[PDB]
Amino acid sequence: MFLTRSEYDRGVSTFSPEGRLFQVEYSLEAIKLGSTAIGIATKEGVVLGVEKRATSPLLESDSIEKIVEIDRHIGCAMSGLTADARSMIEHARTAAVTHNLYYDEDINVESLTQSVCDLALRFGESRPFGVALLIAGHDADDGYQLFHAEPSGTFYRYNAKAIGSGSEGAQAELLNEWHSSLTLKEAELLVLKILKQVMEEKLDENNAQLSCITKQDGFKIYDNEKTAELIKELKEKEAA
Amino acid sequence: VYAINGSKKDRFFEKLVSLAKAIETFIHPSNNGFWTKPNAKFVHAFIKSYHGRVKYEEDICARGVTNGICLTSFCHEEIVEIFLNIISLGSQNKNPDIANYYISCFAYLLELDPSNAYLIYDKILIDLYDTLADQFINSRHRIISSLKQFTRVIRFIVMDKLYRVHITNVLSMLVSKLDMNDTNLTSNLINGIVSIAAFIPIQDLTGEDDYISFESDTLPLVQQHFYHIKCGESSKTFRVDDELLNNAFKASTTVFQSMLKVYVEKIFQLVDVDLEDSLVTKINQTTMILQESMDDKIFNYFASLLQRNFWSNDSFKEKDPNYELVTIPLAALVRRNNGLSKELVRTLLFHIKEQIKRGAGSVRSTSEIQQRDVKLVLYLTALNDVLRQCHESLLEYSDELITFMKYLYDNVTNPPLDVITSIVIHSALATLCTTEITDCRLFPEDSKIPEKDRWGGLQFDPRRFDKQHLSFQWHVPSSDEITLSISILESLSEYCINNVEELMKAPRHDSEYGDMIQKYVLVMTHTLSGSSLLFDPDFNKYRTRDLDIYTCNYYFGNTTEEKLQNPQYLQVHRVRARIGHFFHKLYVFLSTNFENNTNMFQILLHGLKVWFTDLGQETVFNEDPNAFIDVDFLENVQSLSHVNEPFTRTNFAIRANSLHQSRVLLHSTNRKASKLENLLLVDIIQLATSLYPDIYKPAQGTLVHCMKQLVGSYGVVIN
Amino acid sequence: QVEYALESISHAGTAIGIMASDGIVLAAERKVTSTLLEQDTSTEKLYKLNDKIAVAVAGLTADAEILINTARIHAQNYLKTYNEDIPVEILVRRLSDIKQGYTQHGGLRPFGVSFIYAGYDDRYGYQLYTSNPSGNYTGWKAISVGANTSAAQTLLQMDYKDDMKVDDAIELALKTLSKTTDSSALTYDRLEFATIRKGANDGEVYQKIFKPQEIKDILVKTGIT
Amino acid sequence: PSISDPTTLLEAERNDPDGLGLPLKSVPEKVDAYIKKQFEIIKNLEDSVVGLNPQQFIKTDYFYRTSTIFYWIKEMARGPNKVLLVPYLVDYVLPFLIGLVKHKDVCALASLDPVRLYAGLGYMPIRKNHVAAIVDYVCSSNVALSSNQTKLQLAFIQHFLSAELLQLTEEEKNKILEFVVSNLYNEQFVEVRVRAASILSDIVHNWKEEQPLLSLIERFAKGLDVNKYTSKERQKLSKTDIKIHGNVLGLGAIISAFPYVFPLPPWIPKQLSNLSSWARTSGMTGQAAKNTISEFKKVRADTWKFDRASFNTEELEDLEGVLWRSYYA
Amino acid sequence: YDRALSIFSPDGHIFQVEYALEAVKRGTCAVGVKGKNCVVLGCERRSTLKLQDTRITPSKVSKIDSHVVLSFSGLNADSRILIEKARVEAQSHRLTLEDPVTVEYLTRYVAGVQQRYTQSGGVRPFGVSTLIAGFDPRDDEPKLYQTEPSGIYSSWSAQTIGRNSKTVREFLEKNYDRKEPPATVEECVKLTVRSLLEVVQTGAKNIEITVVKPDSDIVALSSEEINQYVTQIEQ
Amino acid sequence: MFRNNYDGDTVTFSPTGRLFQVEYALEAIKQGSVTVGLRSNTHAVLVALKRNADELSSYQKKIIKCDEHMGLSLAGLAPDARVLSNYLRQQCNYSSLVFNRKLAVERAGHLLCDKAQKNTQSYGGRPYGVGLLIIGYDKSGAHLLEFQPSGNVTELYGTAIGARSQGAKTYLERTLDTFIKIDGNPDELIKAGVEAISQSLRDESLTVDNLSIAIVGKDTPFTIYDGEAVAKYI
């Protein structure tokens, strides 16, 4: 093992000779270390899935929630639930309700994604802020949309995106599998298939949580029983 | 470092190259952590211990035959190829003590004389020329590390016929670069200047070769050589006639008078700077080492340049100037040439009379030298420093100095100046009775014939130990200088004895009465010190085959009959009895009339310390910076770990001076008290029992000094 | 993350509180100080909060006097609000909460002081308490803070009896201090002394913060010279 | 190790072929069979867990034995006991950690750190006999490990290689090389290739002869020679081909093994000029190339003023556009 | 051993509360279990120094309102500020909405203050956890919650926050089953009794236990009832 | 092995009169994909090559509309291009409602220089790390400006900025007398720009989504083409 350091490392708000801000680069790779979240967008819905930590049998429920409702139209997934994730979510919630009472109309998903990025450029009020988000929603202009909002205060729209544990091979299988033609059921099976591969081959309703956005029901997180029949549908469909 | 085999080496070196390949990335400056100090101390110890093994083998080989386990030339070459990049990385570290471990490795590698040694010299000259040309301007660590790297290797560059041609160009470029704002860079430039000076003779080596000149001879060989090695080629490829090379060397030496004018002009600029006692001391040492390296032709130029600037300058305008930077150089001139002292000592006392008549020291303050007193302090500190080095030349103007001393003890009474003005007798009496080195020259007296190829000061040349090289003149007190020392001592002491008794009526606390008492008392304390080499710890035993090992040079006798038969011996002790009875009389006067006057008891306690401690020896002004070269400093410039005394004549001379000073100080002063010592001890015990902090703290410090001087004194103190 | 502030008070002279079956007894010792530093002042050890409550202090007077004045202000405000004087428990809790805040809030520093709050009110009777820089507080039968805490608490433990009279608590405080004194005799000028007792004879709370002569009188009762 | 005589001790210390002698401490043969009988009981019990979720697994005898043996290994791995644990790291202790690493959620419900304990066993006080067996075990692909099970083995070769650097023989280091190079072409797992490249840099940094290096450079550069492909072809290849991916990752490991050599070797500019053509390709192969050039430029920013003499204007210009991040439009 | 290529700080960031969460283990054991028709909280009593006055010592278990109780492990000084904040918020809700505070709202507000003392940075988090329990108004489902210094909160069928609370949790998992919990207060009390007598830093001064029953029936068992419950079989 | 002492802050000067932190901000422009601008007398054109993170990703926005008569492009940094572009939108709206004028494109240039130079002079702040090519039309004709993050702006007939721009820039310098005489025909000026950007794509190829184009001048509002609208220029 050898050492590869540099004189411009840990430089805050400082360009290196190359024009690099290494702090925001470092923050942007810590997204590899969290719990796995996956988003699939289709003409039928946006599906968000996340790996759940195993819990004591005595735990009846908890306020750890890596998939969160922002609005009826908009849902969100984290790889970590630090104070900065809470700050971004309660900013996104306050941004949604203020737009609703101003225009009598639902916020566009790009405009909400832009708003949580502006919070990270402001640092609340060249620093990174908080954690990677997947942001999913439907609006009448740009349909079903999935965005990666980043600690840098910048973002991209994706057709499918994986964050957290598993990054290189997690997005490698998604670009191999994604179609314009995916049905919603098929997208759910695909996020469960990807979750099984990243989890070193374990899959229960106790370690996979699913959700989707549709126009008709909006954002909903699936019951353990709904994800359990979907896991059985995966287990038979791969064995067939 | 003891597992290698000179004749079967290849599998050992294959392991050592694989260690260095693993380690290199832990040595690079941006990679700091817990490994840094382990690696710096490992690389240093490996190269140092390998050097020690090579010198053990070279010593055994020189009395017989090579055994074949012995390290060969090929092993020394491998050691450079392995470690040169390790040393090159580790010398750019952010911690300076880390970088010094790797920088000290270059000296061990260069003393091994590998065929690869050009890699090290080329490395160091390229960095040094890129710093002095400001190519590393954004990058301060390069400037400091390059100066340190060059500083380490000057003594080897000086010995090589090709690289020696660069050194006076470097000395000139170093001296031009001394700053008044960058005390750290100036300290590192002064390290370079003193290292060049300690090895090189400041001399013009040109004979009737009047056609050669530094520019067009030395520089054309320093522009071709530098361009050749900077474009990636080596020094091994650089071929030139020995004749062009020797003309480039001889012409290098003609530039020294230009360098010395810039140097004096930097020394007079540094008087105005807020320096540090260690940097001031170092700047004095380099000025003195420059002087001891001059021939008489360059010395006679430098003396006049310095004396001229000392009179004609703009250089003492600040609150608290560095007088030492100019006054220690003048005292060093007069140590080399006694013939300068008569004019410099009559010009100084004229200017002191001018400043005293113009009103210097007419306005009282206890805490400060005032801005109007600064020139009086300059000429008095110059007088103190010059007089300390006058020796047998005081005999020409002794009466004129004694009448001047009286004028100075009449006319100036500012309490900050009484200390400066009373040091005048100390310096006078001290130079008349002291035995010490006069001559510290790199080459003696413009004499002997060690050839013109002496850029190195014989340091490695095996002829350094020679009696005709190390024949130092020394200084041995004359009988005229001893009849003058006693005339000064009893004249001044008796003088101040008739001044303070005619003024001991306790009229009032004028705030100017107390200063006149303090002055005449300070003069009585500056006469006991200075004349102290005349006194004798044993005088009381010899009332009205004893064996000493540390026998210093006394001018009365070593046997008791040799010294009792000289009447001059009794006379010296008689004056010290008369001074000691005066401090007891002054104690009962200040105890009965002036209790609580802290300053008057402090001066008395310092007088009593000097009277108790300075018998046959001097233990105040003993360890402050003076006009001799520092033995611990020149030994740090010149000492090599595995080489026997790799020293120049200056260092051998100041080592013989330090042996004499050691023999003087190691002489016993423990004695059986004399009724007057008991009386003055009991006065000191009462002052240690005083309730003013400012009296009891000095009086307790004097008491612990007195208890070392007197046998059985703890019993007296506790009783 | 406050234990250095608890180290601070350990040097600061000594205070003893002892609760009897019919009163309370505060004693404290002034540190010996420079001849010319003024003693006749407001910065002492045994202070007061209201006619029913007294304090003794360890730690710096500059941190003490702010809390003492806040307590006086809050006690005056409570008496003004309800026409019945503040309970001792509510005073120490109110002073325990102000002190906790300045320890948990990193914009502030922990108060380097620890007061022994003696008092009386009818909801719990006579109440002896200690509070320290952490903002915790405890009720006691006897307590001490500051210098010689450990040595004093052993002598308290081996002599204290729950049934003892106020006069026995006078003896026990004086005899504890004369056992654990840094000076090899104890004198009225180093000693500050107070009691809280049941009236002259009727139902009122009677404080005394003793004057130097009354201290001399109890020292010559108690056989300390 | 209680010997009957000092002279018998010395003879048993002499009898070691290497030059060392009877180990400081060793487990007596009854305790030896006992410790090993505990691992065999765990192996026979593996069919009792095959069907079930983590909470049921946490109720099994097998989990209780696995937890006890995990804690026993962890106490043995501290302090004086490592010499009594090194011998078991071929078929008992070290293998018990690769199996236990597969049970991720059980190692969350119980506070078990087999990933951290296993990687840490690379720093054990191993000896010549055990080095060879450890290398042969570690370099055996034949267990068919999963992505992280074979990536924990990869991580155990990095800590072991740096613990036993300057001990490992050229055959042992060649087995380590060919194992990490075989993992650059791992057909199932994308991240196992990326982890193997990082250990190839670690192997290549400690090479001191040019013939081995020029041979590796040719092995990797042969299979990526840029003139053989059309543009759209080179692009679709970079989304799909494991051999060019492993070649690009491997060539980048060699270049990353040279962070600070001051006069830039002339082979580095040339091989960067092959990677920069792949850096324009978007896929898994294009990221490896972009990341190599970016990390090279990051460590060379200290000396870039002097390094840019070693490149053409066209070559320097081809290093420019490598840093594809959301905020660099 | 995430040094990898001798890498350090490649993420450039840190988040940490866990010094407070360790104090929450050091502190006294506190355990709570639902029944079918009750919730019982039991908390360890600290041994008391020789010269303390016991008459005014707080019950450790702490009523917020007639239907709701709070208990804690962690710093006592911090716990007071949360109990006082929970008591003023419970009075503030009960006044302003004309109905008692719901147990989940009380936990959401206690979690709200532990969130704000996490987020604000100029303050440390409170060194304490909470065990919030009781019944909602007009309801007889027993409800039982935790908060932690992190400001995370959770619902539990049984729970234990302490230093030796990993073996209590194993005894609770061994004997509690959400298909068939201890139904009657008799079983429920005897199970928090069995929990507390296993691993608490016990002595002659031991444990404080409180039963909550529906419709504001809140009762600390007597120092005799905690002894009557010591029904045993031994061999 | 080296340690620059004078590049830690935007307020330090080098001993040679250099602001290194502003030079490193110019080095940030060469981190973003190439953009080209060019002009004649009647029209001015931007063309930009848009990158993406992955094949599932949307393309990053390179061209922004500041008003009906001007807009810019953004190589180097994306988020530093929205702070400047938002301010340039504010200043255009302000010029309409306060003066009843379209903002002059020279005036817009001075306002960017002003905003950028302030960051170069103050502690704690960082020079912008974005290079803008601004195009517009006003009463002085068609214009192109290159803004540099130091606080400087230049009037050009054409330029290129971003990674590997020297190719397109060298083609524009060679083609200058030709593209500046493309008057009354907007499509040939777009094709001259798309051929210029093709000299910077070293082996790469334009596609509908990888290419974006914008034009302004005479009768034409500022319009952006990307997606299917660039199909006739590939």
Where in chain C are the domains?
Answer: 1-225
When CB atoms are compared, the residue of D257, D259, D297 closest to A18 is D297
F65, containing H or E segment: strand F63-67
Neighbouring residues of A114: CB distance < 8 A, sequence distance ≥ 6? A155
F148, containing H or E segment: strand F141-148
Instruction: Determine the structural domain holding residue F37 and report its residue range.
Output: 4-234
- Please count the other Cβ atoms lying within 10 Å of the Cβ belonging to residue B407: 14
- Report the relative pairing of strands E207-213 and E39-44 from DSSP bridges: antiparallel
3-state SS class at D213: helix
Q: Are C20 and C54 in contact (CB under 8 A)?
A: no
Four-residue CA torsion sign, B621, B624, B625, B629: positive
What is the maximum span of chain A, computed from C-alpha positions, in angstroms? 61
* Radius of gyration of the CA atoms of chain B, in A: 30
E131, containing H or E segment: strand E130-134
Question: For A123, left (φ over 0), alpha (ψ -120 to 50), or beta?
Answer: left
- From the candidates F5, F18, F198, F202, which should be mutated to test the interface with D, based on the most D CB atoms within 10 A? F202
Residues of F in contact with B30 (CB under 8 A): 1
Rounded to an integer, what distance in angstroms lies between the CA atom of residue C202 and that of residue D131?
A: 93
Q: Do chains D and C touch (3 or more CB pairs under 8 A)?
A: no
E161, containing H or E segment: strand E158-161
Residue D56 C-beta-side C-alpha neighbours within 13 Å: 8
- From the candidates B19, B30, B35, which should be mutated to test the interface with A, based on the most A CB atoms within 10 A? B30
Residues of D in contact with F160 (CB under 8 A): none
Q: Are D7 and D27 in contact (CB under 8 A)?
A: no
Residues of A in contact with D158 (CB under 8 A): 1
What total of structural domains would you count in chain F? 1
- DSSP calls for B243-273: HHHHHHHHHHGGGHHHHHHHHHHHHHHHTTS
D182 CA: distance to closest CA in chain E (Å): 20
> Do the domain assignments include residue A108?
yes
Nearest CA in chain F to B27: F1
Rounded to an integer, what distance in angstroms lies between the CA atom of residue E175 and that of residue E171?
A: 6
* Radius of gyration of the CA atoms of chain D, in A: 24
Helices B73-90 and B10-27: angle between axes, nearest 10 degrees: 10
Per-residue b or e along B302-341, where b marks 16 or more CB atoms closer than 10 Å to that residue's CB: bbebbbebbeeeebbeeeebbbbbbbbbbbbbbbbebebb
Triad E188, E193, E199: Cα angle to 5°: 135
Rounded to an integer, what distance in angstroms lies between the CA atom of residue F38 and that of residue B712?
A: 105
Nearest CA among B108, B102, B109 for reference residue B87: B102
Rounded to an integer, what distance in angstroms lies between the CA atom of residue E121 and that of residue C106?
A: 9
What total of structural domains would you count in chain A? 1
- Torsion, Cα B88 B90 B96 B98, to 10 degrees, reads -140
- A17–chain B Cβ distance below 8 A for any pair: no
Q: Are D220 and D260 in contact (CB under 8 A)?
A: no
Both tokens of F123, joined, read 């502690």
Rounded to an integer, what distance in angstroms lies between the CA atom of residue F95 and that of residue F114?
A: 17
- A1–chain E Cβ distance below 8 A for any pair: yes
Neighbouring residues of B549: CB distance < 8 A, sequence distance ≥ 6? none
Rounded to the nearest 5°, which phi and psi values hold at B247? -65, -40
Rounded to an integer, what distance in angstroms lies between the CA atom of residue F131 and that of residue F81?
A: 8
Rounded to the nearest 5°, which phi and psi values hold at D79? 55, -135
3-state SS class at D36: helix
B31 CA: distance to closest CA in chain A (Å): 6
How far from chain centre, in Å, is Cα D184? 11
Instruction: Report chain E residues touching chain C, CB-CB < 8 A.
Output: 50-57, 76-78, 80-81, 84, 117, 122-124, 126
Count Cβ atoms within 10 A of the Cβ of residue E122 and give its class: 0-12 exposed, 13-18 middle, 19 or more buried. exposed
- DSSP calls for chain A: ------TTTT-SS---TTS--HHHHHHHHGGGSS--EEEEEETTEEEEEEEPPP--TTEEEES--SEEEEETTEEEEES---HHHHHHHHHHHHHHHHHHHHHSSPPPHHHHHHHHHHHHHHT------S--EEEEEEETTTEEEEEEE-TTS-EEEESEEEESS--HHHHHHHHHH--TT--HHHHHHHHHHHHHHHTTS---TTTEEEEEEETTTEEEEPPHHHHHHHHHHHHHHHH-
Nearest CA in chain F to D328: F77
D80 CA: distance to closest CA in chain A (Å): 27
Neighbouring residues of F227: CB distance < 8 A, sequence distance ≥ 6? F208, F209
Instruction: Determine the structural domain holding residue A37 and report its residue range.
Output: 9-240
Q: Are B56 and B74 in contact (CB under 8 A)?
A: no
Does the beta-carbon distance from E53 to C140 stay under 8 Å? yes
F166 CA: distance to closest CA in chain D (Å): 8
- B258–chain A Cβ distance below 8 A for any pair: no
Does the beta-carbon distance from A58 to E172 stay under 8 Å? yes
Helices D231-238 and D284-300: angle between axes, nearest 10 degrees: 90
CATH number for A87: 3.60.20.10
- From the candidates A10, A15, A173, which should be mutated to test the interface with F, based on the most F CB atoms within 10 A? A15
Q: Are E101 and E158 in contact (CB under 8 A)?
A: no
Cα distances (angstroms) measured from residue C18 to each of C173, C181, E51: 7, 17, 10
Nearest CA among D149, D90, D65, D163 for reference residue D115: D149
Rounded to an integer, what distance in angstroms lies between the CA atom of residue E178 and that of residue E155?
A: 13
Q: DSSP secondary-structure letter at E24?
A: H
Rounded to an integer, what distance in angstroms lies between the CA atom of residue E115 and that of residue E125?
A: 8
Does the beta-carbon distance from B21 to D208 stay under 8 Å? yes
How far from chain centre, in Å, is Cα D50? 29
Does the beta-carbon distance from B21 to D205 stay under 8 Å? yes
Q: Do chains D and F touch (3 or more CB pairs under 8 A)?
A: yes
Chains within contact range of chain B (3+ C-beta pairs < 8 Å) = A, D, F
Residue C172 C-beta-side C-alpha neighbours within 13 Å: 29
Q: Are A128 and A120 in contact (CB under 8 A)?
A: yes
Instruction: Report chain D residues touching chain E, CB-CB < 8 A.
Output: 116, 119-120, 155, 158-159, 198, 201-202
F4 CA: distance to closest CA in chain A (Å): 9
- From the candidates F24, F164, F166, F206, which should be mutated to test the interface with D, based on the most D CB atoms within 10 A? F164
CB contacts under 8 A, D 281-310 vs F, are 282-283, 302-303
Cα distances (angstroms) measured from residue A222 to each of A45, A51, A198, A228, B89: 14, 13, 21, 10, 60
> Do the domain assignments include residue A1?
no
CB contacts under 8 A, A 105-164 vs E, are 128
Neighbouring residues of B461: CB distance < 8 A, sequence distance ≥ 6? B450, B454
Rounded to an integer, what distance in angstroms lies between the CA atom of residue B621 and that of residue B609?
A: 13
CB contacts under 8 A, B 57-96 vs D, are 89
Between D and F, how many CB-CB pairs are < 8 A? 61
Rounded to the nearest 5°, which phi and psi values hold at E67? -105, -10
Nearest CA in chain A to D205: A2
- Options 3.60.20.10, 3.30.565.10, 3.40.50.12280, 2.40.30.10; CATH for E1-235 is 3.60.20.10
Q: Are E74 and E20 in contact (CB under 8 A)?
A: yes
Q: Are D234 and D211 in contact (CB under 8 A)?
A: no
Q: Are A71 and A135 in contact (CB under 8 A)?
A: no
Does the beta-carbon distance from E13 to A1 stay under 8 Å? no
Does the beta-carbon distance from D116 to E1 stay under 8 Å? yes
**C1-225: CATH superfamily:** Aminohydrolase, N-terminal nucleophile (Ntn) domain (3.60.20.10)
Residues of D in contact with B81 (CB under 8 A): none
How far from chain centre, in Å, is Cα A143? 18
Does the beta-carbon distance from C135 to E57 stay under 8 Å? no
Rounded to the nearest 5°, which phi and psi values hold at E36? -75, -30
Residues of D in contact with F61 (CB under 8 A): 329
Both tokens of B579, joined, read 């001074």
Residues of F in contact with B130 (CB under 8 A): none
Determination technique for this entry = cryo-EM
Q: Are D179 and D151 in contact (CB under 8 A)?
A: no
